[PDB]
């Protein structure tokens, strides 16, 4: 460029990835050392990535075909040098319109392992299960999986009906008693 012509000045922590428009995109892992910047837009673009959250639920049936929706608080930190190595596809901020597919596949396989109620009474179990599935697929994306939360459970109006009716049964026990 101008102020960074022969220089780059590696933005460690902000990971400005150089996109060698002169040759398409960089085949060099940025920023592993000061890189020469060709005036034909061979230039760094900040992809800090950095807390990248995506709190997305997926509509899916359950073990008893119940409308379960869990907002997976997806959080990615793309692997420092691997995202630059992903220059054959997405060297930029890894496209967050592609990543939700991790949940549309995994969370659909995760729901119906517990049918809703089992998760309600046993969170940690399925939470670890989904975090492991997500970690494997995060490796397939070349990303570091941060703490992904299994939260904001929507599960079934038949179950909320059943639990309010369970309390109604107890209320009727005492009401008829008195």
């Amino acid at each position: 460029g101008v102020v960074n012509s022969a220089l780059y000045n590696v933005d460690a922590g902000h990971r400005a990835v150089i996109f060698d428009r002169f040759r398409g995109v960089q085949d060099i892992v940025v920023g592993e050392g000061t890189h020469f910047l060709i005036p034909w837009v061979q230039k760094p673009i900040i992809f800090d990535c950095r807390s990248r959250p995506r709190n997305v639920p997926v509509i899916t049936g359950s073990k008893d075909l119940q409308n379960v929706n869990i907002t997976l608080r997806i959080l990615f930190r793309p692997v420092a040098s691997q995202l630059p190595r992903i220059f054959t596809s997405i060297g930029e901020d890894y496209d967050e319109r592609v990543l939700p597919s991790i949940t549309t596949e995994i969370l659909k396989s995760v729901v119906a392992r517990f049918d809703a109620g089992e998760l309600i009474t046993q969170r940690e179990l399925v939470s670890r299960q989904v975090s492991d599935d997500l970690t494997e697929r995060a490796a397939t994306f070349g990303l570091i999986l941060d703490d992904v939360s299994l939260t904001h459970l929507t599960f079934g109006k038949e179950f909320t009906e059943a639990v309010e009716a369970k309390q109604v049964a107890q209320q009727e026990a005492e009401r008829a008693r008195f």
Binding site: A12, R73, A80, I120
Partner: protein
């Protein structure tokens, strides 16, 4: 002016990773509360307001029952000053608000599912 170009003074409750962006790496130079050396031309402060910062987070949670109920926590918190560069390399200077909804939504939900809350 020149004073600010050579040093930076924090009265309290704030840190700053004086990270050298231009010609070298200086991220270890964490602003000690008070006066501390840094050159903005090359060395850019990543400022963290490490004071007891509240945040009330509310969410429906589970239980040893099918019932979910809204439980809330006023998250008072301080970023771990002496490990700011580490998190800066991982999550950066906004994690103090972005990581918490991944934290509390399982702190609560785990604990309350273990009990009948």
């Amino acid at each position: 002016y020149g004073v600010r170009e050579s040093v930076f003074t924090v009265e309290g409750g704030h840190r700053a990773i004086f990270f050298n962006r231009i010609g070298g790496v200086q991220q270890d130079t964490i602003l000690a509360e008070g006066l501390h050396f840094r050159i903005p031309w090359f060395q850019y402060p990543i400022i963290y307001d490490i004071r007891a910062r509240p945040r009330k987070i509310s969410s429906p949670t589970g239980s040893k029952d099918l019932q979910m109920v809204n439980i809330s926590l006023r998250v008072l918190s301080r970023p771990n000053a002496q490990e700011l560069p580490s998190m800066y390399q991982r999550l950066g200077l906004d994690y103090e608000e972005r990581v918490l909804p991944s934290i509390v939504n399982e702190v609560l939900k785990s604990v309350v599912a273990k009990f009948n809350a």
